């Protein structure tokens, strides 16, 4: 009474769990911020809190402007510039022939705020501090970071050009 | 259950579905006895599987035959085909084998068209 079509029992690979490669086997919609209008961002009022890149410091030295005194010329109001902990970890990592930027970065009017990351990479430390709040005002001169923030609504980007700095997405320019 | 045997019979475009089961000896065509077939001259063309082998061998069986298609004549060649096939396929199933080869040699010597369909497929010369 033995069964028909009997075959030697062998190891399934597409189905078994003991294999390494086969061991593996609530939506989320973030609300657009209660500050934000269509693009206007009606909450940001002076004084401002501005994040700073490595690159914004480096082109600040070549264009002979102070950070704090030179930002207030572009911005026309009071500002509290603050370098994160990832960004200071880049400025040290740039090394010996950027150390004059690293002196100017640690200035007690330049504030520092920590972060909870596993990394140095501050180009993506920074956008993540921007989406979750949208109170900050990014100061960059990285090309890829500008494109990363011009898609974000209502975040005033700030770059350095020629003599003084320039702002882009502030509605209250003057 | 009920012992039955179903055989077919086919002339020009007429089928013939002859159920043969063990019974009392009635022979029906389309819910009507076989003594009431239409063309009335060709009624002995369907009494051939009755009278060739002998009318005793229908004493225990039923022959329910229903036909569609064909004309007046080409149905009579279908009921004589499916009664001959329905008789000779009941003796190989539910009665004795030596009955069957007595029948299949009886219908053969008389007219082989009783058993196998004489298919007049064309010929090109």
């Amino acid at each position: 009474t033995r069964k028909f079509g009997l075959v030697k029992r062998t190891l399934n690979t597409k189905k078994d769990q003991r294999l390494k490669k086969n061991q593996e086997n609530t939506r989320n919609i973030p609300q657009v911020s209660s500050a934000l209008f269509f693009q206007y961002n009606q909450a940001i009022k002076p004084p401002y809190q501005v994040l700073i890149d490595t690159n914004f410091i480096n082109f600040s030295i070549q264009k002979k402007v102070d950070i704090v005194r030179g930002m207030m010329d572009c911005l026309l109001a009071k500002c509290n510039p603050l370098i994160t902990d990832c960004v200071m970890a880049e400025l040290e990592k740039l090394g010996p022939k950027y150390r004059i930027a690293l002196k100017l970065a640690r200035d007690p009017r330049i504030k520092r705020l920590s972060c909870s990351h596993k990394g140095t990479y501050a180009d993506d430390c920074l956008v993540h501090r921007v989406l979750q709040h949208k109170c900050y005002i990014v100061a960059t001169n990285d090309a890829g970071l500008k494109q990363r923030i011009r898609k974000i609504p209502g975040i005033p980007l700030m770059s350095v050009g020629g003599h003084a700095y320039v702002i882009e997405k502030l509605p209250d320019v003057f | 259950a009920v012992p039955s045997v179903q055989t077919f019979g086919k002339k020009k475009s007429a089928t013939a579905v002859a159920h043969v089961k063990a019974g009392k000896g009635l022979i029906k065509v389309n819910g009507s006895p076989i003594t009431l077939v239409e063309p009335e001259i060709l009624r002995f063309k369907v009494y051939e599987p009755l009278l060739l082998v002998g009318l005793d061998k229908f004493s225990n069986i039923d022959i329910r035959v229903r036909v569609t298609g064909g004309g007046h004549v080409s149905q009579v060649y279908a009921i004589r085909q499916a009664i001959a096939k329905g008789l000779v396929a009941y003796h190989q199933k539910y009665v004795d084998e030596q009955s069957k080869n007595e029948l299949k040699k009886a219908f053969t010597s008389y007219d082989r068209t009783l058993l196998i369909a004489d298919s007049r497929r064309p010929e090109p010369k």
Binding site: - | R121, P122, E123, P124, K125
Partner: protein, 282 residues
């Protein structure tokens, strides 16, 4: 046979539809052979393929009649059947005999109470190359189809200006020997289909000095066929006419036989189109 004859059609399709996807690979292997022969530059998508590169090392050893007629083409003589529509008039039942005489290897089987399945299916069985069926209007024959049998194509022809041979005089009887042919003014690729589907109705390899020649002439989209005998004088050829005059016009071309009636339509005469009268072979 019936299951065998069906399944060779299915594989012939899959052998044909494979070629359309491999026609692109057929084209690119020309580029590799020429650039290996003469010429440095080599295009971009053919550069990045490592598949086609290894594939070429076998493919370097590779190299016209129609694909249906390809196996028989010169080898076996055709045997054809001229048969008539249904209860023919006595004018056209003469006229099927001129078609039976215009080809060699042609037999005339009178049709009545045959169906087109069991006249096709009892012909693939007996084995014939193709089938010639005629139609008529009031004695004037109008239509004509040739249908190659081993799942081959069919070509429904309309034929307008006919002159039957039995009208004229008791001049005699035809030569019936293997004819030479004359195909004029066939330029189109669809025109080459009508070449290769008409040409194989004659027995292969006629003699160099056989005396009757059958012209198929295509002035003005109406294929005009005449039957001629010729003799050659001291200076010129002198000819005379025997047999039928046709005008003829194909109007639909199936890939199946004339049985099938749902086969793929290779060509179909569109009448009702803004540019219908403009083009030729359209």
């Amino acid at each position: 046979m019936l299951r065998r004859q069906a399944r060779e059609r299915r594989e012939y399709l899959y052998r044909k539809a494979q070629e359309l996807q491999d026609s692109q690979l057929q084209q690119k292997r020309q580029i590799i052979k020429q650039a290996l022969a003469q010429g440095k530059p080599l295009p971009k998508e053919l550069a990045e393929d490592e598949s086609l590169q290894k594939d070429f090392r076998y493919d370097q050893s590779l190299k016209q009649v129609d694909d249906e007629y390809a196996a028989t083409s010169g080898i076996m003589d055709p045997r054809i059947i001229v048969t008539t529509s249904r209860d023919p008039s006595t004018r056209l039942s003469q006229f099927a005999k001129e078609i039976k005489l215009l080809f060699p290897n042609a037999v005339r089987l009178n049709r009545g109470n045959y169906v087109m399945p069991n006249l096709v299916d009892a012909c693939k069985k007996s084995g014939t190359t193709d089938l010639v069926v005629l139609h008529e209007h009031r004695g004037v024959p109008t239509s004509l189809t040739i249908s190659h049998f081993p799942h081959g194509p069919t070509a429904q022809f309309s034929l307008h200006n006919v002159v039957m041979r039995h009208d004229i005089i008791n001049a005699g009887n035809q030569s019936e020997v293997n004819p030479h042919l004359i195909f004029d003014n066939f330029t189109t690729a669809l025109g080459k289909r009508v070449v290769c589907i008409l040409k194989h109705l004659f027995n292969a390899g006629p003699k160099k000095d056989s005396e009757r020649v059958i012209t198929f002439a295509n002035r003005g989209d109406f294929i005009s066929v005449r039957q001629h005998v010729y003799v050659r004088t001291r200076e010129g050829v002198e000819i005379a006419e025997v047999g039928p005059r046709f005008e003829m016009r194909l109007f639909e071309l199936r890939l199946g036989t004339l049985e099938n009636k749902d086969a793929d339509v290779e060509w179909q005469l569109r009448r009702f189109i803004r540019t219908a009268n403009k083009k030729d072979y359209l």
